[PDB]
Design a protein around this nucleic acid. Sequence first.
DNA 1: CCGACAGCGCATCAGC
DNA 2: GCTGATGCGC
DNA 3: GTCGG
Length: 326
Amino acid sequence: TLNGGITDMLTELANFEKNVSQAIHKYNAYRKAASVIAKYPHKIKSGAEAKKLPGVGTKILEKIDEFLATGKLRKLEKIRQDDTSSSINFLTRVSGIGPSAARKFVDEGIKTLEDLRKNEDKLNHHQRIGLKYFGDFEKRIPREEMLQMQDIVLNEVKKVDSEYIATVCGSFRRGAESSGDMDVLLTHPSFTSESTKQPKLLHQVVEQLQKVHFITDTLSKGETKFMGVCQLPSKNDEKEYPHRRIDIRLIPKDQYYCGVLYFTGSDIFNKNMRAHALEKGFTINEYTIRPLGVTGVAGEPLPVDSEKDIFDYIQWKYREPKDRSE
DNA sequence: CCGACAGCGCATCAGC
DNA sequence: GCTGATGCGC
DNA sequence: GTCGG
Ligand SMILES: Cc1cn([C@H]2C[C@H](O)[C@@H](COP(=O)(O)OP(=O)(O)[C@H](F)P(=O)(O)O)O2)c(=O)[nH]c1=O
Ligand SMILES: [Mg+2]
Ligand code: NA
Ligand code: NA
Ligand code: NA
């Protein structure tokens, strides 16, 4: 964190542009800059120095000089003092409330945590669970806890059917000492790009995890993506663990390497890589990498036997998960 | 300049 | 109900 | 907001 101050500033700028301005490209532009600066291994002494980095242009360069000079940014000082922006920014911190719901709530005079609780009946299901565990979802998960959650998920999954493979991704797979939530990639030989020889493949796993009281709430659920809430069991007299966000993604087994690339991230790494794919004339999603031909239309899925194969296609040297934290 | 900016699952809604 | 757009989140 | 062509 050589440039902690600068990257914080940019993140706050990005959050403002997304939550308040609803200008999603500014949001992504700022986030790109924050990222390229965060891994830059010198303490930045100049906006111009920073401008040499891709993703940092004039505007961010001027902002960086200001921040360096004063330790603050006037633009952010004003935003901080504005009540409508501050309220909107705050409400988007509840899972399920985005920029549109946040602005809608503020317009109704609903702009604090107590207002939300007092108006719980004006929230959809997701927003209601998001509000219920607001404090909890702000807490990080130490890797020691992720390891216990892994144990539970993999063993429980094995009881349902020993032919399931469950893989923990997210920052956990990138080797982080703590994670914001748990991401689980699930495969089963029944489910491939060819056939779905078995229904409820996801339901059966979710059901079991609920049965043993690991999964406590559902945010959303479909046939291939579960998003919900889970909790480690605590021992006698012990304070309960916080509740945790958990996502489970069932992917066709023959599409594992694209799936585990996707779900390992980071999100910004995924965006950079998919952009580079496009430049090289391929397109990548969590399922396949395909060639983009002449007219921009996606071609047929190219064969993949490893994560590195995907990298090879777009002529990137392989990067280990731990070097994908962008 | 200025067009493009990663790609997609699920929930909710409008319109039919 | 279905379909398409939008919101939100990954 | 940044950028490649
Ligand atoms: C938010 C987001 C996530 N992803 C992928 C990449 C992430 O690593 C994976 C899990 O999302 P996440 O938001 O939980 O991020 P993460 O990498 O797991 C964080 F480091 P953590 O949740 O561990 O704090 O989903 C994307 O492809 N696009 C996105 O916009
Ligand atoms: Mg995660
Ligand atoms: Na630059
Ligand atoms: Na939110
Ligand atoms: Na997640």
